Design a protein around this ligand. Sequence first.
Ligand SMILES: Nc1ncnc2c1ncn2[C@@H]1O[C@H](COP(=O)(O)OP(=O)(O)OP(O)(O)=S)[C@@H](O)[C@H]1O
Ligand SMILES: Nc1ncnc2c1ncn2[C@@H]1O[C@H](COP(=O)(O)OP(=O)(O)OP(O)(O)=S)[C@@H](O)[C@H]1O
Ligand SMILES: [Mg+2]
Ligand SMILES: [Mg+2]
Lengths: 463, 464
Amino acid sequence: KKTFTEVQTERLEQADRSVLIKCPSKLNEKKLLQYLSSHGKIDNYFFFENRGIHALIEFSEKSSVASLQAVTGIPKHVVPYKSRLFTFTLKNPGSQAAEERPVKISPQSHIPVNELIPKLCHADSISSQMYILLNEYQLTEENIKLRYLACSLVRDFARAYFPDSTVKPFGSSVNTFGKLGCDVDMFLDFHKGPFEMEYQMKRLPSERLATQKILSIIGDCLDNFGPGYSSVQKILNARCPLVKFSHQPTGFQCDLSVSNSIAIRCSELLYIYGCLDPRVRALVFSLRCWARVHGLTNSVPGTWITNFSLTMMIMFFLQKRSPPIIPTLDQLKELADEKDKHVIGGYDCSFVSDLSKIKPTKNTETLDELLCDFFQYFGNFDFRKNSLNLRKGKEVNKPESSPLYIWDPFEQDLNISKNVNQPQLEKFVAMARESAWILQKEDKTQQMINKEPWGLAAVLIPF
Amino acid sequence: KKTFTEVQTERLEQADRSVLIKCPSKLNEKKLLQYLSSHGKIDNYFFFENRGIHALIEFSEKSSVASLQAVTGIPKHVVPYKSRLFTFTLKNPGSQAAEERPVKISPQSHIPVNELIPKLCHADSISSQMYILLNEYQLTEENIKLRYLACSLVRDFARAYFPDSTVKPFGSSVNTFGKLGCDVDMFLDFHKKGPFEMEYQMKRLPSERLATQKILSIIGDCLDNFGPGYSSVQKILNARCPLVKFSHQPTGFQCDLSVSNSIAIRCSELLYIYGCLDPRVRALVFSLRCWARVHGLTNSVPGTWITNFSLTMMIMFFLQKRSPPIIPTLDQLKELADEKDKHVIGGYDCSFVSDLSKIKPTKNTETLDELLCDFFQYFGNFDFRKNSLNLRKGKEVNKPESSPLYIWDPFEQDLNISKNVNQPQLEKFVAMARESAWILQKEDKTQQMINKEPWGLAAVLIPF
Ligand SMILES: Nc1ncnc2c1ncn2[C@@H]1O[C@H](COP(=O)(O)OP(=O)(O)OP(O)(O)=S)[C@@H](O)[C@H]1O
Ligand SMILES: Nc1ncnc2c1ncn2[C@@H]1O[C@H](COP(=O)(O)OP(=O)(O)OP(O)(O)=S)[C@@H](O)[C@H]1O
Ligand SMILES: [Mg+2]
Ligand SMILES: [Mg+2]
């Protein structure tokens, strides 16, 4: 089985030797690939629709990019920054010499709620509803390659002066809980004679200020040299210095931070839980959707619960099952060799990487029960006295006054849901309580017969 | 003699395979070159003094740089940008007192005025004074290699984002009129089987002016934050020519980085021709540049003052007007230019002969004694209010615009290169020329030598 870190390395290596080609108006697929193949073998490719037809081409060898860049020219007022974004037109527009087939468009966004509801209503069980949702919403192989490519393009800027750099995606994009249309969270990562011979190199300041200057410049580069980047927003003074930007070629909204290797460990953690049992993913997607539908989450930050916080609450829920659906963080820590040992900023972030080594769950609860039980469980959870600990998998006394306390499983000084206020917590608790009520006391078979919402769909519409 | 463009290409190729090594405190020359030679043959090298001992090493093969970079490490924080700047220390510092010869230091600056004056007084003719000055002030072979290396390093740096880039020096650094301690003017220059026209996505901007501004702004910041040796980085992006100024500590040069101004190069080649044509040309410019500085007619900061470039062009016009001319007019060079020497840039014709052998050598035989005094006499009595200087025609013509001092930009015509100059400064110039000419005419040379006093060039190179 593929370990998180193996998958990152592979995906990055693939995106490394990938390019984006704005295709001709009247397009011939075969002639294009035949032509491109002349520069080297093509492992994968696909087409998508983003203000015209674009194609992602993944070569087998990185040299194929160089080869292809050789024959590529500048449109003779531009900034001559040469990246892996191409525009292909015909030399002789009047030499079209084959039948026109239509190309398959890989979708890059999910169907909206209003269209999803019908499909859910026409399913058999609530279990199947959640799996329909999961399939309609989850990242596709294509979308993923496109996410890693975005990172790969941003990497190329940074390497100008930090040659060993990488830009690594973290968060929902890579932890199996990613849905179509979600943002790409990126962080920039940096790691004889009679003479001692050293390069002269400019010293940097302390961590935080170096970060700020590096991002400020890279931001400006994206804004001024980089094709496709718009709405570049420097938020350098946050707790984690950050640059936000929109990347039009791939259509992703993006977040670029520096060197937070703790967040990665948690992204790997969530990846494990996501990979362990398909019910885990199914449940997160439906409940993330639920939260959005009732206005418990928001696109902008504030007093609301966040998807990440909500996700962690769901992980705690699954830890508490009889028997558990997923092990505690400590239980993974207990199975970690010294090769899986990582200590970062003083904090232990050690846990098993190999998935085979984990004892598969004996739990057999259906998603029907788990969904309603989630609403029941947190609807009757004493938030004022108890806090969520994912290391121990137990309710414990709150170390601090905060309406909703969830123990940051790595930087254990912290409350990840610290932002949440009492009002929003209560609106969450009331929605859970109403939600659980609806599922318990609804007459399923009659709703189907009446052409009405039931199960998942019933709770995925405003009250 | 080689052609401007041939010389640039060669100098750049040499600087391409050159490096800088901050040397040990107690240095052994032989052991160092012996060691460095292991990585490949060394065509040239020398040492200079810039806050400690540095050495320039020019290998015969570019691979020697790669070889040497292989064994070089990072100082164990820093920006890991690997360039051609090295620091060499001793593994066992207290196991040797092997001081070198001590090593010869190639000077990189000229002696000051106060020391130069004696040497001038001690010469025979005014002609010889000017040539002493010329030799004391002009660029040395070493300083030149160091200038091209600066450009070569900035090139590599720029090439981080723009792999096909080149950085070319222009101005006094390469037009034969360069003196020790003058700034390095650089400009950044940019240089199908199958059924497809394949082209990059790039942002379409309004003018080429804006691209320039953004490219320099970023490169400036990169020099400031990531680049080794660069300090005092100043973005002057809104000038007539967008510019970044910076100090480069390894070579100790103050530098000016602009983008893609291939007109200025043509004028740098023009001045190179005039400089190469006759040694009196260079001699006269150096002495008169020095003269101007001494009397406060020029300044280090820009403003109402005449500039060295403007002053240089005035001297070129003077030499055009001789009987017979010491140098041909720009048009006369334009007339001798083949279609290979034809260049049209931004609409402007900048065509003129490159080959120096093709130009008719001057029949003029005036001595520098006469020319110097005649310069002061000529411009002291020049009607600046009516007449303007045209170096294409080599003639006084009516001023196209109200401006105290008008000199026709020989390429971008309908520009006045001395536009900045106001009436007061022009007059202070005219008065200094008039006094200067008077002193040379009515001075009793032999008596001044006998009296242990300044004479000729030295007489006019001290405040009045
Ligand atoms: N308070 C926090 N405490 C610990 N880690 C955090 C916190 N906030 C964000 N992170 C980490 O940063 C990653 C990305 O942040 P978010 O984009 O806000 O959330 P997300 O997991 O990516 O899900 P989305 O983007 O809302 S669908 C999270 O997955 C965490 O690894
Ligand atoms: N007012 C100007 N008008 C036209 N061209 C100019 C002007 N100023 C500078 N240039 C051009 O830029 C080149 C370099 O500018 P400068 O560094 O200011 O002068 P310079 O020739 O290097 O002599 P120095 O540095 O004063 S000794 C000049 O040789 C011109 O080609
Ligand atoms: Mg995210
Ligand atoms: Mg200069």
